[PDB]
Design a protein around this ligand. Structure first.
Ligand code: MG
Lengths: 136, 217, 99, 120, 192, 45
RNA sequence: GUUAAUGUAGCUUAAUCAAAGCAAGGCACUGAAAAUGCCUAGAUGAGCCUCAGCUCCAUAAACACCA
């Protein structure tokens, strides 16, 4: 009740909010909206490393926004046969892609981060850092 | 308070080939193999192995093996690159091709007029220059080599001050993509070295704390 | 325009019949479980030295950058900014056999 | 014949009971309390307690929950209270540790689900 | 017309600016806990506790006791640490744990309980039943010496009197067997 | 640090048998791909 | 070598029933997190003493020092 000392005790909605630019200042320099593309041939491997990345970010207080899978590209590899001169033979492969979006960074945290990411790189794992604009 | 300006560089070689596994990691790898193959659904190869192993017993009384042996011989015939290009030499610390498993770092030998210097490669930057530009410049110029090395940040790795005057040593991290070393037999002593060896060859307390921001792996 | 591969393919439906049996004695059961607990302790110590490592690195960053600011203010005008060179960072993971 | 507390029923759990079983699970210890609506703990069994701690192993195990339940049933009969209410969380009701806590409590002779009031 | 809060407002502590960098409890359960701890503190506004009779609230206790048994903290601690090392060492125990088969020797736990924290539990049961309220009126004592009372229901039958338990007057037609542990320089008085 | 996430199984509920395969791209380099075919090696031209 | 302090598990309890709570881990569950379930490791800085006292060691913060 407005007249009382206890007014607004139940007030909550400012606590829970239920209702993009990199900021470069040259001294406090926040470079955000960054895309981590983890691409590898093995399903389990890419998933495990994407997982490791995700968890690493959550522990480092680095804010992850979106973690999602990119469409798999199916490769058909045509190998030359020696007997028949121009004769082709085939083997089937698949390329798997995962994505982890981080919303903020600083110079020092970029430097630190990349060290850990590439140091812990598993075999047959291709890593990419890019900018938020991409077209699915 | 005069300030002596010296840039510096920590040069990281990429570990090339993966490491062997800890006994625990190996037993765990075994377990993961077993349990993975335990929940697994059929196989195409195993459908054609088992269904035909069963159906041929019904064509006798009333393939898979070929493929197996084929792949066996095609694998066995083929041979692979050596995991050790270091210990077959066992000598060179100065070879850039030395260690496949770990990350390697560059050291240099200098004896100056008043001094004896074992040196993590150092730069000298004029006040008008950026620490970055002098890092790169000193890198490409000093080693007499063509190096593609992707740098990470515009921010430096670690800093150590020697005040006689006052002075600064600012170490940067450079990630080596592909180096081309010209005059592989040059007199200047360039030592490509791991973590333990970086602990060994380093006298100073300025270079002793470089293994503090180094990646131990 | 989303299309996921998380879906279970149609080939896998009726070929289910190939892997019915699984059985373990006291031996394999207790072995696997003991190994698992062991493994958890291990992975924990691993994460611990990992975090302590990146923490020591970040402390080297503190001492470093603060040293450079205390010396030359122009130098933390320069080096506290993040460069455009970091946009397309790409790195390949190690292999089993060198080329 | 006494008065339970009817009410609340915007909130949870129901405060209507004479006695309530309360099971708190720390990442280390399992603590089972018997409460009166006064908030006063009447009779309890905990795993921090040396009596239980020393006999058995791994304070956080399902084993520990069963144990604590048996101990608490014993101490409850000794206290003269045969009835109490237990209001678990839907996901706590599915969990094994708690199923077996309730089983121990039941074989112990303590009925959950208090008798009704008279002329309520 | 506003008034001014008296002392602290409950959530006034945490920063509204930058909500994303604040840790949340994504668990219903953590919330429940935090709330039940908040419900036990002495607030400055009219509350449930206040009206519904905490029964004198804060009370300075006149204590007519037997002096607490003096035991060395560090010694006890070491001994228990060791005992638990030993018990955790065995593989048999761990097998008993994973396979969900174990039992606790209830008689020995009842023994240790009677020896250790029993007096306090018996105390708060007495407080619950208001023994102290009708006897000494203000006074709380801790039952240091365990008292074992029993009735003979027959030749083989023994009905124990624990604190708070129910007994039928048929059982109690005769004087009970009473047992407690003391050497003799001692003198005691028993009362029903 | 290379062995960190290297040890794992595929977590999907219903899936075929996956078998270790050594894959040589055009380098001289070899990788380990889990592939449904038991063949110990494959190589790209 | 000097001053103001200390050495509880990663941060904070208790030290008259008792070394407590929270982080943090693993495996299971759904695509990742998250929740949940089943599990995991842990401390009173080290040496003596009296039934808080004396040192040592180490950190930290300064100064001196050393390069
Ligand atoms: Mg104690």
């Amino acid at each position: 009740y407005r007249s009382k000392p206890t007014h607004g005790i139940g007030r909550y909605k400012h606590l829970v909010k239920a209702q993009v630019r990199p900021i470069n200042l040259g001294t406090d320099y926040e470079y955000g909206v960054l895309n981590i593309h983890l691409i590898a041939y093995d399903m389990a491997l890419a998933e495990s490393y994407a997982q490791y990345v995700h968890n690493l970010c959550n522990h480092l207080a680095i804010k992850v926004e979106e973690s999602y899978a990119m469409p798999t590209k199916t490769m058909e590899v045509l190998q030359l046969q020696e007997q028949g001169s121009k004769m082709f033979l085939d083997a089937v492969l698949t390329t798997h892609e995962r994505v982890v979006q981080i919303s903020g960074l600083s110079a020092t945290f970029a430097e630190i981060f990349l060290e850990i990411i590439h140091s812990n790189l598993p075999e047959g794992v291709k890593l990419s850092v890019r900018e938020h604009t991409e077209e699915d | 308070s005069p300030w002596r300006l010296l840039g510096a560089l920590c040069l990281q070689r990429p570990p090339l080939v993966t490491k062997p596994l800890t006994p625990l990691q190996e037993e765990m790898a075994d377990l993961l193999q077993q349990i993975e193959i335990e929940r697994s659904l059929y196989s195409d190869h195993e459908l054609r192995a088992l269904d035909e192993a069963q159906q041929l017993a019904k064509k006798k009384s009333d393939l898979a093996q070929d493929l197996e042996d084929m792949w066996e011989q095609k694998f066995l015939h083929f041979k692979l690159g050596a995991r050790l290009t270091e210990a077959d030499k066992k000598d060179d610390r100065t070879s850039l091709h030395r260690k496949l498993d770990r990350n390697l770092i560059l050291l240099v030998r200098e004896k100056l007029g008043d001094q004896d210097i074992w040196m993590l490669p150092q730069s000298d930057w004029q006040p008008g220059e950026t620490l970055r530009q002098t890092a790169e410049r000193t890198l490409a110029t000093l080693s007499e080599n063509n190096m593609e090395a992707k740098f990470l940040g515009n921010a430096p790795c670690g800093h150590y001050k020697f005040k006689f005057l006052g002075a600064k040593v600012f170490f940067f991290k450079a990630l080596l993509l592909t180096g081309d070393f010209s005059q592989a037999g040059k007199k200047g002593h360039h030592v490509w070295v791991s973590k333990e060896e970086l602990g060994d060859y380093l006298k100073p307390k300025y270079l002793a704390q470089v293994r503090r921001f180094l990646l131990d792996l | 325009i989303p299309i996921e591969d998380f879906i279970t393919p149609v080939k896998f439906l009726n070929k289910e019949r190939q892997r019915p049996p699984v059985e373990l004695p006291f031996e394999e059961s207790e072995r696997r479980a003991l190994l698992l607990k062991r493994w958890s302790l291990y992975k924990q110590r691993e994460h611990e030295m990992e975090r302590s490592a990146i923490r020591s690195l970040l402390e080297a960053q503190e001492e470093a950058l603060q040293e450079l600011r205390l010396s030359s203010p122009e130098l933390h005008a320069e080096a506290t900014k993040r460069d455009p060179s970091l946009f397309p960072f790409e790195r390949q993971g190690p292999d089993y056999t060198p080329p | 014949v006494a008065r339970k507390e009817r009410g609340w029923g915007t909130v949870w759990p129901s405060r209507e009971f004479w006695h309530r079983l309360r099971v708190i699970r720390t990442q280390h210890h399992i603590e089972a309390l018997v409460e009166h609506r006064n908030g006063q703990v009447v009779v309890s069994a905990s795993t921090r307690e040396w009596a239980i701690k020393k006999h058995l192993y791994s304070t956080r195990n399902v084993v520990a929950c069963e144990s604590v339940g048996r101990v608490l049933a014993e101490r409850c009969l000794e206290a003269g209270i045969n009835f109490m209410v237990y209001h678990p969380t839907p996901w706590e009701a599915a969990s094994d540790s708690i199923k077996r806590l309730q089983h121990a409590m039941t074989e112990g002779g303590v009925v959950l689900r208090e008798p009704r009031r008279i002329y309520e | 017309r506003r008034a001014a809060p008296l002392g602290p407002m409950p959530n006034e502590d945490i920063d509204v600016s930058d909500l994303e960098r604040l840790k949340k409890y994504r668990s219903f359960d953590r919330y429940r806990r935090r709330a039940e701890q908040e419900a036990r503190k002495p607030h400055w506004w009219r509350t449930y506790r206040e009206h519904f009779g905490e029964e004198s609230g804060p009370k300075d206790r006149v204590d007519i006791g037997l002096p607490p048994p003096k035991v060395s903290r560090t010694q006890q601690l070491l001994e228990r640490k060791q005992a638990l090392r030993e018990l955790r060492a065995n593989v048999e125990e761990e097998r008993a744990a994973r396979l969900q088969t174990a039992r606790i020797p209830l008689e020995a736990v009842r023994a240790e309980w009677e020896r250790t924290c029993g007096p306090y539990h018996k105390q708060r049961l007495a407080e619950y039943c208001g023994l102290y309220r009708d006897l000494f009126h203000g006074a709380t004592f801790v039952p240091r010496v365990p008292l074992h009372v029993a009735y003979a229901v027959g030749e083989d039958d023994l009905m124990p009197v624990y604190h708070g338990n129910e007994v039928t007057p048929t059982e109690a037609a005769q004087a009970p067997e009473v047992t407690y542990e003391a050497d003799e320089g001692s003198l005691w008085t028993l009362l029903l | 640090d290379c062995n960190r996430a290297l040890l794992t199984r595929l977590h999907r509920q219903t899936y075929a048998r996956l078998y270790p395969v050594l894959l040589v791209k055009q380098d001289g380099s070899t990788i380990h791909i889990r592939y449904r075919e038991p063949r110990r090696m494959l190589t790209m031209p």
